[PDB]
From a paper:
Protein complexes of the mitochondrial respiratory chain assemble into respiratory supercomplexes.
a–c, Atomic model of complex I, showing the 14 core subunits in shades of blue (a), cofactors bound to complex I (N, FeS clusters; Q, ubiquinone/ubiquinol; FMN, flavine mononucleotide) (b) and accessory subunits of mitochondrial complex I (c).
Numbering used by the authors:
A (entry chain W): 119 to 133
B (entry chain E): 30 to 221
C (entry chain S): 2 to 94
D (entry chain I): 143 to 150
E (entry chain R): 37 to 109
F (entry chain Q): 47 to 151
G (entry chain F): 51 to 484
H (entry chain G): 57 to 743
Amino acid sequence: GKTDFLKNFYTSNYF
Amino acid sequence: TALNYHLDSPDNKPDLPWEFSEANQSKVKEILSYYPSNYKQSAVIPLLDLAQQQNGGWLPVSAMNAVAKVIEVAPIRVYEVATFYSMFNRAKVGKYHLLVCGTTPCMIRGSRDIESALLDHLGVKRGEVTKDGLFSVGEMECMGCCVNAPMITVADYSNGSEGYTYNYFEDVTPEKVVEIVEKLRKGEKPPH
Amino acid sequence: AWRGSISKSMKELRILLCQSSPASAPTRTFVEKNYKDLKSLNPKLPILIRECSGVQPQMWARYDMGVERCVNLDGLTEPQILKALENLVKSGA
Amino acid sequence: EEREDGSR
Amino acid sequence: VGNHTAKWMQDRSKKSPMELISEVPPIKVDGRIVACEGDTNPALGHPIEFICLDLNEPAICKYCGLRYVQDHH
Amino acid sequence: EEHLSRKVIIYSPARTATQSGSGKLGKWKINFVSTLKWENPLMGWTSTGDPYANVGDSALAFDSEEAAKSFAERHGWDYKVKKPNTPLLKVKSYSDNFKWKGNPQ
Amino acid sequence: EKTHFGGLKDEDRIFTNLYGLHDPFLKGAMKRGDWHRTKDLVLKGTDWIVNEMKKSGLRGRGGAGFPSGLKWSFMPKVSDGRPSYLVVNADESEPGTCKDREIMRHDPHKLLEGCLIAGVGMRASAAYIYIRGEYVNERLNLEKARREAYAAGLLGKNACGSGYDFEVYIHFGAGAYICGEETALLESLEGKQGKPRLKPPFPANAGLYGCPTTVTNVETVAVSPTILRRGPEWFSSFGRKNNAGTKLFCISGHVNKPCTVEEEMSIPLKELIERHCGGVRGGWDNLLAIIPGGSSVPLIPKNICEDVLMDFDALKAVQSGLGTAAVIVMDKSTDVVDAIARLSYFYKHESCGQCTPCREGTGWLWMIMERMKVGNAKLEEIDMLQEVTKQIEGHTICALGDAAAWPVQGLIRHFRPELERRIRERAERELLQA
Amino acid sequence: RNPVGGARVHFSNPEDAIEVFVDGYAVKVPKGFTVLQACEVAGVDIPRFCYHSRLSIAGNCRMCLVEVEKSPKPVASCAMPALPGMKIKTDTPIAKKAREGVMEFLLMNHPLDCPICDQGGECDLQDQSMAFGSDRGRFTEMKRSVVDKNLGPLVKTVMTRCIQCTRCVRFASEVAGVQDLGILGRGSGEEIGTYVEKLMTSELSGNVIDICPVGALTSKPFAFKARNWELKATETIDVSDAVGSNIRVDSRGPEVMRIIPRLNEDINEEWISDKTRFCYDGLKRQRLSDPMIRDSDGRFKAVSWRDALAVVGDIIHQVKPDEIVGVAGQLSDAESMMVLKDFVNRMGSDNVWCEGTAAGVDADLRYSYLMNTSISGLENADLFLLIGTQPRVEAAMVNARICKTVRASNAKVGYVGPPAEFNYDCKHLGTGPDTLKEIAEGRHPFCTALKNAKNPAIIVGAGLFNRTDKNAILSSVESIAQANNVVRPDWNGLNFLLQYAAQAAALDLGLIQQSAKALESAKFVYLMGADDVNVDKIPKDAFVVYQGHHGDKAVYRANVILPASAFTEKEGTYENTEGFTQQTVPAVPTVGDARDDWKIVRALSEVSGVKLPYNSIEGVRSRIKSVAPNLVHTDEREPAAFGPSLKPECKEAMSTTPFQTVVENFYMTNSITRASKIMAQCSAVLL
Ligand SMILES: Cc1cc2nc3c(=O)[nH]c(=O)nc-3n(C[C@H](O)[C@H](O)[C@H](O)COP(=O)(O)O)c2cc1C
Ligand code: SF4
Ligand code: SF4
Ligand code: SF4
Ligand code: FES
Ligand code: FES
Ligand SMILES: [Zn+2]
C-alpha cells in the first residue's frame, strides 16, 4: 500500500 | 656567508627592541623632509644607512623593522632592499670594517696580495670578528681605475653615526696595511 | 475592516510578478500602492513579494495544515487585484 | 602520499 | 613502523626502508653544494639532483634519501 | 530502453586553473553523472556497474552545443545545458604600475 | 680644426678645477666664473635654453650619446597637475671611470648651476642627485656646496633672484652597478630594489613617482651653464659634425702615465695615448687590445686603434662605443681571455636578476669563460658561446645584457686563434700525460 | 576568428577602437590593449610565464617575445601597448629563436625532478618545452640549488623549481592584501621567501599554488597523492559560505582528491578561499552512514531505513502541532528546505526556519537580505561603509573584491563594529549603534565623505539580524541610505551580506521563525543538518531527530540519526548573497546507506501519513515555482523590483549593545570543516 517512491527509497539513493 | 634568509639568534631576533636614538631623530626628520610625505619609502636607503651606523656597522632584523615602521611599509620590502644592496651588513662586523680583495681593474696590478697578510696579522678568517670585537675583514667593492694602487676600504663604526667615515687607502702593502691596523687600534686615523 | 484581519485568516501570502512585463504592471502597482498599509495593519503576516523574469502574475495564500489557494492575476486591474485579496481573506480562511 | 620523513 | 609503512608492509622481521635510510649517516661534503646520482654509475641511479647545504640540518636527496652536510661550516 | 531515460548534462569544460594555456576549450561534452562506484573487498580497487562510467569523458565528444543537443534529443535523453563562463578582456597597462599617488593629503 | 682634432687649450677647457689645485667651494667657484649672471639665463626662458642646447650639439655623456636638447624638449610644456623632476645620474659604478667623481670633488658648483639650468630647461620644480653609495666624502662635499648655494640664495625659493623656484636634494645608493641604469635609478630613488622598468612608459611621461622626469649624466648637466654663457657655436666648433664639444677622458692600464684629461671630441685614440699618457708602456708596438670607453663596450685590436677617432660615430663604426670615455689599455703581456672572463664575472655579479636571459646567461657565459681560460673546452664550444651571447643580446629588459654579451663577442671576433691555441695545448697535454 | 578561450571584448564606444594586424589578419581591439591581448583576440596563443591577466604586468620571463615590424628588438607582447597599423608576427624565425633561447635559459638551472614533481602532467614548462623549444639540452655545468622554505601547513615548497616569475609576490601584494612574500637577493641567487620565519596567514594563500607555473609552490595536503591525468573533473559550486564560489572538484574513484577554483567573472575570478580549497578532507571523516535509534542503554544502534522512519512517524503523531519544530542546516539545498517546510506546515506547525542569525528576519522584500550592488558592481563603488560585518572571515571573496576595488579605484572604507584585522586601509568609525546615530545626524568627516561619494555602498552584515534592536538598526541604516541617495535607479548601493549557503534560498522560500521561543517548548525537533543550533535550549524530554552527513553536539542529543548526502554527492539548488541561483553537480557516490535530504523528508512525510504532491526532484522544483520562482530560474541576473519605500515606519528605540563577531573561527564554520585534519591544523598554527 505504498507508492513506488518509498520502495525505491528503501532500495537505494539512485532511482 | 651572506644568506637570503634570517635565522633567529640571541643578538639578532625580532623581539629585541630597536629604535632610532634621540640624537638620530633630527637626522631622520631631515632625511624624510627631502621627499613628499606620501613617498616616505624613498628614505629606506638613507635610513638603513643611518641605522647601520648607529648599530655599530650592521643591521639586525629589529633595525629593519624599525625602518619599516618609520617609512610605513611592510617589513618584507625593507628586507628586499637590505638584501639587494651590498653595502648593508646583515651580520656583525668589527668597529673597523676592513674591505679587501678587489675586482678586475686592480687584480691586473696584483691586488690579491693584501688579504692573506691581513688575516695572518688579525688571526681570523674572512667574515669573522676578532675576539676584542675591533676588526672584521669583508669584500671590497671597487670604484675608479685602480691606477696607482692596490687599495683597501676602511669603514669606521667605532663612534656611531657621528663618527662614521668611509675611506679608501692607496699604495697599501703587506707592511702598510698592518701599520693602518695598528693606528686604527691606537685610535689615530690613518693617513689617506 | 477585512484588511486588518488578514493575519487571523491566513498564515502566509505570496505575490509573484514580473519585474518588467506589461502583464505584471497592475500587480506591481497594487504592491507599490497597498503593501505599506497591508503590512502596517498586519505586522506579523509574512507577505512574500517574489519577482521573476518570466512568471505570470500570481497570488497565493497559505492557510492551516498547509492548504493553499492561488488566483491568476493576468488581465486584471489594480482594484480587482484588491477584490481577489479580499475574497482570499474572507472565503476559505 | 608523503612519508613520515617527507619522502615521496 | 609509521602509518605510511603499515599500509603495505605486513612483516616486522626486517626494518622498513624509512628506518634503514635514516640509519645511514649524513655524507660530509667540502662545499655548499653537492650532486647526487644515487649510484656510482650515474646511468644506473636516479636523475641527477643538486642539493644545497646552506642549512644546518642535513639536506636530503629527494630521490634516494641520502643525506649530506657541509664538512666545515 | 532502461539506459535511454537517464538524465544528462551538456556543458563545455572550463580551463584548468593550474595552467595558463587555453587549448582544451571549445569542446562540448555530455555528462552522464555516473556516480555509483565502490571498493572491491579484495584489493581495494574501484568497481562499478554503470555502463556509461567513462564513455562521456573518453570517447563521446561534440564540437558544438547544437551537435550535442541534437545527439541527446535523438537518443531521447533528458538534458540540461550549462553555459560556460568566459573571461572578460580588460584594458591593462604596464604604466599603471607607476601611477602617481597625487599630492599628499 | 676641421681636419685634425686634439690639443685642446686651457682657454677652451670647461672643467678648470679638474686637477683640484684651487678652492672648489663657493668663493673659488665664483672666482672661476660659476653662478655668473644665472638670473639672465633663467629669465631667457625654457625655450631659449632648449634651443641653445640643441644648437650646441651636446650629446649624452652617460654612454648612450643621445642629443641632450631633444631629450630635454621631450619634457611636457604644460603641467597636467603632476610636477616635473630632474634626476642627475652620479652613480658611476662602471669599472675604470672616475670623471663624475672628479666633477663632484672639484667642481660641485658647476653641477649645482647645471642642475638649476637644466631644471629651468625642463620646466622642473625639483632636482634629485643620485650619488654612488661609496662616494661618501664626495657626497659630503657636494652637500656642503649645496648648503653654500642655498645660503647665498642661488637655490631654493626665488633661485638667483629670477623668480623661479627649484629645490635640489642629494640621494645616494647602496652599492649596485645596475642602479646606474636610468629606470633602475628611478626605482631605487623610489625606495625599491634597483630593477629596471620596461619601456614604454618613458621617463619623460612617467618617471619618478610616475611624474615627467629626465635622467641625465653629471657631465652632461655640469657643462650646460658654460655652453649657455660661451655660446653653442663655440661648443660646436670642437669635434666632427654630430660629435661636437669637449669630453672628459680618463686613460688607465698599460700606459706610462695614466691620467684624467679634458680633450676635444673626435681626437685620435693613438694621439690621445701618446700625447697625454706618454704612450703605451713598452711602445705602441707592444699594444695588444684597447677598450675605448668603460667595460660595457667591445675591445678593438691594435690595427683598429691606429686610426680610429674618439667619438660616438667612429667607435660605433668599428663595433665599439665611446661609452664613459674610460680608456683601458692592454699590452702584449695581458692574458686577454682572463680579462674577458673577469668582465663576465663582473656582469654575472652585477646582474639584477629580474629577467631570465640576463639572469641565467650571465652565469653561463662566466662558467664557459672560466673553462676556456685554461683550455678545458672543445673547439665547437666557441660557436656555442657566440650563440649564447646572441640569445642574450636583444632579449633583455635593459642594456646590461648587451653589455654582458659584447666583450665575449669581441673576444671571439678578434682573438679566436688564441682560444683555439689554448684548447689545442690543453688537449696536447691531456694526450701525453695520460 | 574566435578569441582565445572565448574571451569577451567590451567596447565603451566603437570610436575608441584601433586596428592591428596579427600574422597578416585584421583584428579590432579597444584602445589600451597590449600586443598579447590583441594576439588573444586574433586567436593566437602566445606562451607566457610571468604574465597573469589578474595581476600587474611584470615582463620578466621574456617568453612572450614577438616580432613587430619596424621594431629593432623582439617585443614583450604582455607589456607593449597595441598601436594602430601595428604589424605583429608570432611565428617568424626571430620569434621562434627568441622563444628557444629563453626556454633554454629557463631549463638551465631547473632541477631534473619531473617524476617527483606534482606539476608533472599539468606543467606549462613541460608543454612549452615540448612545443617551442624542442632544442636538445647543451648545458653541462653544475646547476644552482636552493634550500626549501617553511610557509605553513598548506603550501609545500620546492624552491629549486622556481623560475623567479614573481607571480606569487604580486598576488600577495595585490590580491591577498598581505605583504609577506618577497624576492630577496640579486642576480641568479635571488630567492623568493619571507626572509624571516613566518607562515602565509592570508585566507587566500592557497591560490599561489594555482598561479605558480612550476612545482615550486604545491598543495601540502595533496602532495604526491595523484597525477592530474587520473582525476575526474566535476564543475560545481562551494557551500562553505554564502558566496557560491565556482569550483572544480577532482576525484579518483569514490574519493575527492582536491578542489581548485573555477572561473566566474561575476563571483570569485578564478580565486577561492583556503576554507573552500582544503575542506575536502572532512568529506571522508566521521560520516553518518546508517540510520540509528538510541537503544535501551542510551546507545545508538544501526537499523534499516524502514524501522527508523516508522519510529519517527509513530512518535510525531503523539505531540501537539505547535510542538513540532524543524530547522534547516546551513548547507541545505533549496529542494530539501521546501520539502521540509511543506512537511512541517502539513503537520499543522509554522516553526520552520534556517539556522543562523537571519532566522526570523522580515523576508517580504528581496532587497532587504541580498547584496543589491552585486559582487561585480562593487568595483564601481567609490566609498564603502561596513556595518557590523567582517567580510574577511564572513565572505572571503567579497572581501577580496572590496580590497581589489580599494587598491584600484582608491575607494574609502568606513567600518562600524568590533575591532578586526582588515587587509586594506579603513577608518574605524565606532563599534556599535551610537555610531549609526552619529552617522545619521552628520557632523563628521566621514559623513561629508559619504555625502561627497558618487556611488557609495553600505554593506550590512546578517549577524545584526538576531539582535533585539534589529528594526531600529535597519531603520537607521535605511535612513542613512536615503539621506545620501544611496539607492537610485542607476545605482543600488544598499547591501546585506549573508553568511550561510542556504540562507538566501531559505529566505526566498519563507522559512521564517515566527515564535522566538518555539525551540524551548518543542517536543519533536527535526534538525535537517542544523549542527550550529544551540541544543541545550531544547527540552530534555523532546524527541530530537538529526539528519545530516556530519555532526558533533546535535548527534549526541539526537534520538534518531538519518544519514544524508553531502554537497559533492548530489544535485542541489543554492542561492548566494547577491541573489544568484546556482546548482551543484554530483561528483562522487554517497557513503554507506545515506540518502538525499529531500528524499528523506518526503519518505518520512509518506510514512507519517502526509501525501506530498511530488515524487521526484522535478516535482519539487515545480512546487518551488509556486513559492520562489527565481530559485528555479538558475544562472540568471535580475535587478530589484521594489525598494525601501514600501517598508513600514519603525519607532523602536536604539540599544547600546555593541556589534558582536559572527565568525569566531574562519576554519571552523560548518560540520564538514570541523571534521578535517587540515582545517584543525590551520586553526592551530595559522590563526
Ligand atoms: C647597466 C647600466 C649602467 C649604467 N650606468 C650609468 C652610470 O653610471 N651613469 C650614467 O650616467 N649612465 C649610466 N647608464 C645609462 C643610463 O641608463 C642613461 O642612459 C643615462 O643616465 C643618460 O644620461 P645622458 O643622456 O646625460 O647620457 C647605465 C646604463 C646601464 C644599462
Ligand atoms: S638585463 Fe640583467 S640587469 Fe637588466 S633587467 Fe634584465 S636581469 Fe636586470
Ligand atoms: S615544474 Fe615539475 S613537471 Fe614542470 S618541468 Fe619542472 S620538474 Fe618537470
Ligand atoms: S615560487 Fe612559483 S610563482 Fe613564485 S616566483 Fe617562483 S615560479 Fe613564480
Ligand atoms: S683592489 Fe682595485 S678596486 Fe679594490
Ligand atoms: S609573459 Fe611577457 S615577459 Fe613574461
Ligand atoms: Zn640521491
